[PDB]
PDB file of C-alpha atoms in Angstrom:
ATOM      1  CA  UNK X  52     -13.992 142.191  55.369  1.00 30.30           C
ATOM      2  CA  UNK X  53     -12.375 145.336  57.209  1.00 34.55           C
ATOM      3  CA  UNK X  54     -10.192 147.687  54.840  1.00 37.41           C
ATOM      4  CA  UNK X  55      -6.195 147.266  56.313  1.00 42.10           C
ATOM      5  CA  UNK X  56      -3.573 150.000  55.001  1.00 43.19           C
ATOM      6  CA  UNK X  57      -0.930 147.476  53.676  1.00 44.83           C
ATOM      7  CA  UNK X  58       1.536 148.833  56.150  1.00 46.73           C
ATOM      8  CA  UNK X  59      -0.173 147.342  59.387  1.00 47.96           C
ATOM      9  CA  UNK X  60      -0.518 143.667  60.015  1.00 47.35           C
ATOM     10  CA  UNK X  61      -4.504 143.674  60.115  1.00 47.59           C
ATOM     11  CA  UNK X  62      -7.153 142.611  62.636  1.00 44.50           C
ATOM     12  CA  UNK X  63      -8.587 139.689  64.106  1.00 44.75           C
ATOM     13  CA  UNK X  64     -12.308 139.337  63.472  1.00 42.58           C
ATOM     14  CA  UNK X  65     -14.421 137.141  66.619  1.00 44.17           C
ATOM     15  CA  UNK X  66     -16.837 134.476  66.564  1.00 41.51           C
ATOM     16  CA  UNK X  67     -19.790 133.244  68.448  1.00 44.55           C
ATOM     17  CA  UNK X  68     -21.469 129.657  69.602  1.00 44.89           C
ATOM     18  CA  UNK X  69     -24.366 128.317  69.752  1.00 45.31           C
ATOM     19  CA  UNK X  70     -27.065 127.033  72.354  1.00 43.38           C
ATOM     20  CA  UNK X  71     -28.944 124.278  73.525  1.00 48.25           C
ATOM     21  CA  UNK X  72     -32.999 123.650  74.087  1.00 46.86           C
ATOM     22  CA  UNK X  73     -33.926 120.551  75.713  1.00 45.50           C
ATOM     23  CA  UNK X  74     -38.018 119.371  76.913  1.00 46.19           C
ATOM     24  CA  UNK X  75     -39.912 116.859  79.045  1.00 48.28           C
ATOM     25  CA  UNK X  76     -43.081 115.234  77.985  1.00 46.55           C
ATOM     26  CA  UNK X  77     -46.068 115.738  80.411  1.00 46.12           C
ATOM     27  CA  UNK X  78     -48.275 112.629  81.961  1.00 51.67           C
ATOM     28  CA  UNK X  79     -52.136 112.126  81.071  1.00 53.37           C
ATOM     29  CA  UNK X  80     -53.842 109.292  82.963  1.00 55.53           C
ATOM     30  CA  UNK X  81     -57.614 109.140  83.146  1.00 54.78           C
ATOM     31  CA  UNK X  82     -59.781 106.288  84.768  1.00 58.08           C
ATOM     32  CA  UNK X  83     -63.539 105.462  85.046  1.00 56.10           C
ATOM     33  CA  UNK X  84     -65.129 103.476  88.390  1.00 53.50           C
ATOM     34  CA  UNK X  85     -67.905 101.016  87.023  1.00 55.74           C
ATOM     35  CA  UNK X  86     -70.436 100.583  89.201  1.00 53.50           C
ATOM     36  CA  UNK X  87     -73.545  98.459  88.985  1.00 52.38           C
ATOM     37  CA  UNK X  88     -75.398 101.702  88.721  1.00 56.08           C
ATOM     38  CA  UNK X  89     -73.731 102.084  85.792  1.00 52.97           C
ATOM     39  CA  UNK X  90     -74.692  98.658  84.416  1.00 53.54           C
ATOM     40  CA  UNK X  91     -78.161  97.701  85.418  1.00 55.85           C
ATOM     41  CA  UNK X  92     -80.503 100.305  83.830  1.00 55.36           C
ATOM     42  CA  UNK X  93     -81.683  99.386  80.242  1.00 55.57           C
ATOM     43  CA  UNK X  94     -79.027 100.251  77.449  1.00 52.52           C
ATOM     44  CA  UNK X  95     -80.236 101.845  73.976  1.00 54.18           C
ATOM     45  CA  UNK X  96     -80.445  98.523  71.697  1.00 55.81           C
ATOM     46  CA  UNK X  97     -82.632  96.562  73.861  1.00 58.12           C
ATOM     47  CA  UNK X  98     -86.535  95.830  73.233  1.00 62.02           C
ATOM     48  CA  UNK X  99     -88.968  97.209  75.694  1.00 62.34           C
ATOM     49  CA  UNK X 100     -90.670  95.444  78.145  1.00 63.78           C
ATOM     50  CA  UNK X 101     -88.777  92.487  78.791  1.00 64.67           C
ATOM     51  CA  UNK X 102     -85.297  92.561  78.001  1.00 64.95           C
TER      52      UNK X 102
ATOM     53  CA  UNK E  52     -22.518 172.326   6.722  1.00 63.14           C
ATOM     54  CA  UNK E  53     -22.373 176.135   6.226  1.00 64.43           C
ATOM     55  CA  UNK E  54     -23.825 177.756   3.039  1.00 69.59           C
ATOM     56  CA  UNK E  55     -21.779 179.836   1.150  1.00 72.00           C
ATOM     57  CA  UNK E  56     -22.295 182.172  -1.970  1.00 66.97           C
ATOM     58  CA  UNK E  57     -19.793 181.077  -4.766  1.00 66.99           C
ATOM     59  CA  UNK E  58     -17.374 183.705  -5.014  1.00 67.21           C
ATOM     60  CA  UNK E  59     -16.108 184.237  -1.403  1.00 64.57           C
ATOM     61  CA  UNK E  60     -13.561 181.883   0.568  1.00 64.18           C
ATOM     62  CA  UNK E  61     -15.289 180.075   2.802  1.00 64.99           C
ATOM     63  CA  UNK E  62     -15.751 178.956   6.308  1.00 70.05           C
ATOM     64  CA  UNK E  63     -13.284 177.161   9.037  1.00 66.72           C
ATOM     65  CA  UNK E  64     -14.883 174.250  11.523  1.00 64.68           C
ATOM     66  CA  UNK E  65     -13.317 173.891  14.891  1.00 64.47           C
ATOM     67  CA  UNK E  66     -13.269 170.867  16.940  1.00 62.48           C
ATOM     68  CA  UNK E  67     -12.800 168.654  19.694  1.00 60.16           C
ATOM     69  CA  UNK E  68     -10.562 167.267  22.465  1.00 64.00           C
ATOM     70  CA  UNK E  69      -9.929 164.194  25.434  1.00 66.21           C
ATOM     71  CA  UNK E  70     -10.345 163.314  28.485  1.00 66.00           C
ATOM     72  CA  UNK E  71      -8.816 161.135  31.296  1.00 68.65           C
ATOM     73  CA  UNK E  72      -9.575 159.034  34.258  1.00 69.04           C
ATOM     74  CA  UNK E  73      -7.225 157.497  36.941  1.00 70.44           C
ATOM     75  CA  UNK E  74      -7.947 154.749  39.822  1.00 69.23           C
ATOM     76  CA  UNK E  75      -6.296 152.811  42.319  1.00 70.14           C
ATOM     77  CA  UNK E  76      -7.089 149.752  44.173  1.00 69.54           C
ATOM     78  CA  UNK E  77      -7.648 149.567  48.109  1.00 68.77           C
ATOM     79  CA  UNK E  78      -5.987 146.864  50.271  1.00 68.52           C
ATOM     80  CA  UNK E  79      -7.930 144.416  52.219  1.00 67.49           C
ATOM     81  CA  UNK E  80      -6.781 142.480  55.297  1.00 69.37           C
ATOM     82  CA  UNK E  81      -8.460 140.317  57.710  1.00 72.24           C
ATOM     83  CA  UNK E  82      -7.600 137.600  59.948  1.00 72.40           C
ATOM     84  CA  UNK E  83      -8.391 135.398  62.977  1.00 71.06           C
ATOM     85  CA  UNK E  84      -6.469 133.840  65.259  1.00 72.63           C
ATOM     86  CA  UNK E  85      -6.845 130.299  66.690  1.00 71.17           C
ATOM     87  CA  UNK E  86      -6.210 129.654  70.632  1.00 71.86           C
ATOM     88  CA  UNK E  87      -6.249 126.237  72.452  1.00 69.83           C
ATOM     89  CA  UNK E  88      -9.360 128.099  73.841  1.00 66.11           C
ATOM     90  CA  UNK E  89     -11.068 127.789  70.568  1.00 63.71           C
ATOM     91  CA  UNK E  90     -10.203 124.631  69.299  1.00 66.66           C
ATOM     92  CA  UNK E  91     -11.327 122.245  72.925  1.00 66.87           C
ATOM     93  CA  UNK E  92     -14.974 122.871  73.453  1.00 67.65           C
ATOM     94  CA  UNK E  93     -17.137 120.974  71.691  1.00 66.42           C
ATOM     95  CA  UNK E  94     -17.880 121.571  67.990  1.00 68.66           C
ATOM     96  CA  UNK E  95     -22.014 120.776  68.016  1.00 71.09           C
ATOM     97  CA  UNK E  96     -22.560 117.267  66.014  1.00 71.71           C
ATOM     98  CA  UNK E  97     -20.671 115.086  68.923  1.00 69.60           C
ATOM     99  CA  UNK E  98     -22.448 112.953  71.201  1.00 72.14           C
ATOM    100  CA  UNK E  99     -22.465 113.412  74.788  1.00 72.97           C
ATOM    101  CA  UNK E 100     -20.526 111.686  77.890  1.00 71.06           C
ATOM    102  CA  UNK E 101     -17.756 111.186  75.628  1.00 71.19           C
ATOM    103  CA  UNK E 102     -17.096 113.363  72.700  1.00 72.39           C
TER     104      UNK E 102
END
């Protein structure tokens, strides 16, 4: 607090405010195709030969 | 103490004095004033649109 000789009236002291943050969310959006290539050769689990 | 054969007089001890301290307080005087300026925008907890 500022030192005031009692004669004088004194001083005004100032302020301040504040601020303001503000966001968006981005957009993810993957796909696959599914072909038959994709489904007619042989898959792990399955016994060889026939199938 | 002083040693001193036992016929003569004997011996005289000086000693001490004071001393003094004096204060005063210092004078302290802030203040603020308060506008319309101040007192409309929005404090920050108020919800918006409509505060």
């Amino acid at each position: 607090a500022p030192f005031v000789a009692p004669n004088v009236q004194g001083r005004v002291i100032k302020e301040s405010g504040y601020n303001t943050k503000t966001f968006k969310p981005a957009y993810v959006k993957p796909k696959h195709v599914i072909d038959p290539n994709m489904i007619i050769p042989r898959q792990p689990g399955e016994a060889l030969g026939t199938g």
